[PDB]
Amino acid sequence: SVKEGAQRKWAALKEKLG
């Protein structure tokens, strides 16, 4: 469960940094 949530955050930040 914790892994799933973190995933959404990971990609989120990744997108921010072009």
JSON list of N, CA, C and O in Angstrom, two decimals:
[
{"chain": "A", "resi": 1, "resn": "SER", "atom": "N", "xyz": [0.83, -1.20, 0.00]},
{"chain": "A", "resi": 1, "resn": "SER", "atom": "CA", "xyz": [0.00, 0.00, 0.00]},
{"chain": "A", "resi": 1, "resn": "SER", "atom": "C", "xyz": [0.87, 1.26, 0.00]},
{"chain": "A", "resi": 1, "resn": "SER", "atom": "O", "xyz": [0.68, 2.15, -0.83]},
{"chain": "A", "resi": 2, "resn": "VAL", "atom": "N", "xyz": [1.81, 1.32, 0.93]},
{"chain": "A", "resi": 2, "resn": "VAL", "atom": "CA", "xyz": [2.70, 2.46, 1.04]},
{"chain": "A", "resi": 2, "resn": "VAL", "atom": "C", "xyz": [3.46, 2.69, -0.26]},
{"chain": "A", "resi": 2, "resn": "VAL", "atom": "O", "xyz": [3.72, 3.83, -0.65]},
{"chain": "A", "resi": 3, "resn": "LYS", "atom": "N", "xyz": [3.81, 1.61, -0.93]},
{"chain": "A", "resi": 3, "resn": "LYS", "atom": "CA", "xyz": [4.54, 1.69, -2.20]},
{"chain": "A", "resi": 3, "resn": "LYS", "atom": "C", "xyz": [3.71, 2.40, -3.26]},
{"chain": "A", "resi": 3, "resn": "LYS", "atom": "O", "xyz": [4.21, 3.27, -3.97]},
{"chain": "A", "resi": 4, "resn": "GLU", "atom": "N", "xyz": [2.43, 2.03, -3.35]},
{"chain": "A", "resi": 4, "resn": "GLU", "atom": "CA", "xyz": [1.53, 2.64, -4.32]},
{"chain": "A", "resi": 4, "resn": "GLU", "atom": "C", "xyz": [1.50, 4.16, -4.16]},
{"chain": "A", "resi": 4, "resn": "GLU", "atom": "O", "xyz": [1.73, 4.90, -5.11]},
{"chain": "A", "resi": 5, "resn": "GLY", "atom": "N", "xyz": [1.21, 4.61, -2.94]},
{"chain": "A", "resi": 5, "resn": "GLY", "atom": "CA", "xyz": [1.15, 6.04, -2.68]},
{"chain": "A", "resi": 5, "resn": "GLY", "atom": "C", "xyz": [2.41, 6.76, -3.10]},
{"chain": "A", "resi": 5, "resn": "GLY", "atom": "O", "xyz": [2.36, 7.73, -3.85]},
{"chain": "A", "resi": 6, "resn": "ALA", "atom": "N", "xyz": [3.56, 6.28, -2.61]},
{"chain": "A", "resi": 6, "resn": "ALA", "atom": "CA", "xyz": [4.84, 6.89, -2.94]},
{"chain": "A", "resi": 6, "resn": "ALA", "atom": "C", "xyz": [5.01, 7.01, -4.45]},
{"chain": "A", "resi": 6, "resn": "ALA", "atom": "O", "xyz": [5.57, 7.99, -4.95]},
{"chain": "A", "resi": 7, "resn": "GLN", "atom": "N", "xyz": [4.54, 6.01, -5.18]},
{"chain": "A", "resi": 7, "resn": "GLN", "atom": "CA", "xyz": [4.65, 6.00, -6.64]},
{"chain": "A", "resi": 7, "resn": "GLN", "atom": "C", "xyz": [4.04, 7.27, -7.23]},
{"chain": "A", "resi": 7, "resn": "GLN", "atom": "O", "xyz": [4.66, 7.94, -8.06]},
{"chain": "A", "resi": 8, "resn": "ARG", "atom": "N", "xyz": [2.82, 7.59, -6.81]},
{"chain": "A", "resi": 8, "resn": "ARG", "atom": "CA", "xyz": [2.13, 8.77, -7.30]},
{"chain": "A", "resi": 8, "resn": "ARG", "atom": "C", "xyz": [2.95, 10.03, -7.03]},
{"chain": "A", "resi": 8, "resn": "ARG", "atom": "O", "xyz": [2.96, 10.96, -7.84]},
{"chain": "A", "resi": 9, "resn": "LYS", "atom": "N", "xyz": [3.63, 10.06, -5.89]},
{"chain": "A", "resi": 9, "resn": "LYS", "atom": "CA", "xyz": [4.45, 11.20, -5.52]},
{"chain": "A", "resi": 9, "resn": "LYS", "atom": "C", "xyz": [5.73, 11.25, -6.36]},
{"chain": "A", "resi": 9, "resn": "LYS", "atom": "O", "xyz": [6.15, 12.32, -6.80]},
{"chain": "A", "resi": 10, "resn": "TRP", "atom": "N", "xyz": [6.33, 10.09, -6.57]},
{"chain": "A", "resi": 10, "resn": "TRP", "atom": "CA", "xyz": [7.56, 10.00, -7.36]},
{"chain": "A", "resi": 10, "resn": "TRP", "atom": "C", "xyz": [7.37, 10.63, -8.73]},
{"chain": "A", "resi": 10, "resn": "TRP", "atom": "O", "xyz": [8.06, 11.60, -9.08]},
{"chain": "A", "resi": 11, "resn": "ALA", "atom": "N", "xyz": [6.45, 10.08, -9.51]},
{"chain": "A", "resi": 11, "resn": "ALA", "atom": "CA", "xyz": [6.17, 10.60, -10.85]},
{"chain": "A", "resi": 11, "resn": "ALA", "atom": "C", "xyz": [5.83, 12.08, -10.80]},
{"chain": "A", "resi": 11, "resn": "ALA", "atom": "O", "xyz": [6.27, 12.86, -11.66]},
{"chain": "A", "resi": 12, "resn": "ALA", "atom": "N", "xyz": [5.05, 12.48, -9.80]},
{"chain": "A", "resi": 12, "resn": "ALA", "atom": "CA", "xyz": [4.66, 13.87, -9.65]},
{"chain": "A", "resi": 12, "resn": "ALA", "atom": "C", "xyz": [5.87, 14.79, -9.64]},
{"chain": "A", "resi": 12, "resn": "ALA", "atom": "O", "xyz": [5.95, 15.74, -10.43]},
{"chain": "A", "resi": 13, "resn": "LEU", "atom": "N", "xyz": [6.82, 14.51, -8.76]},
{"chain": "A", "resi": 13, "resn": "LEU", "atom": "CA", "xyz": [8.03, 15.31, -8.65]},
{"chain": "A", "resi": 13, "resn": "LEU", "atom": "C", "xyz": [8.85, 15.23, -9.94]},
{"chain": "A", "resi": 13, "resn": "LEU", "atom": "O", "xyz": [9.39, 16.23, -10.41]},
{"chain": "A", "resi": 14, "resn": "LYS", "atom": "N", "xyz": [8.94, 14.03, -10.50]},
{"chain": "A", "resi": 14, "resn": "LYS", "atom": "CA", "xyz": [9.69, 13.82, -11.73]},
{"chain": "A", "resi": 14, "resn": "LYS", "atom": "C", "xyz": [9.21, 14.76, -12.83]},
{"chain": "A", "resi": 14, "resn": "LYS", "atom": "O", "xyz": [10.02, 15.38, -13.52]},
{"chain": "A", "resi": 15, "resn": "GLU", "atom": "N", "xyz": [7.90, 14.86, -12.99]},
{"chain": "A", "resi": 15, "resn": "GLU", "atom": "CA", "xyz": [7.31, 15.73, -14.00]},
{"chain": "A", "resi": 15, "resn": "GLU", "atom": "C", "xyz": [7.73, 17.18, -13.78]},
{"chain": "A", "resi": 15, "resn": "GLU", "atom": "O", "xyz": [8.04, 17.90, -14.73]},
{"chain": "A", "resi": 16, "resn": "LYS", "atom": "N", "xyz": [7.72, 17.61, -12.52]},
{"chain": "A", "resi": 16, "resn": "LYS", "atom": "CA", "xyz": [8.09, 18.97, -12.17]},
{"chain": "A", "resi": 16, "resn": "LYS", "atom": "C", "xyz": [9.49, 19.31, -12.70]},
{"chain": "A", "resi": 16, "resn": "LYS", "atom": "O", "xyz": [9.71, 20.38, -13.26]},
{"chain": "A", "resi": 17, "resn": "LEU", "atom": "N", "xyz": [10.42, 18.38, -12.52]},
{"chain": "A", "resi": 17, "resn": "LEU", "atom": "CA", "xyz": [11.79, 18.57, -12.97]},
{"chain": "A", "resi": 17, "resn": "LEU", "atom": "C", "xyz": [11.96, 18.10, -14.41]},
{"chain": "A", "resi": 17, "resn": "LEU", "atom": "O", "xyz": [12.09, 16.91, -14.68]},
{"chain": "A", "resi": 18, "resn": "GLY", "atom": "N", "xyz": [11.94, 19.05, -15.35]},
{"chain": "A", "resi": 18, "resn": "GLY", "atom": "CA", "xyz": [12.10, 18.71, -16.75]},
{"chain": "A", "resi": 18, "resn": "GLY", "atom": "C", "xyz": [13.52, 18.34, -17.11]},
{"chain": "A", "resi": 18, "resn": "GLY", "atom": "O", "xyz": [13.77, 17.74, -18.15]}
]
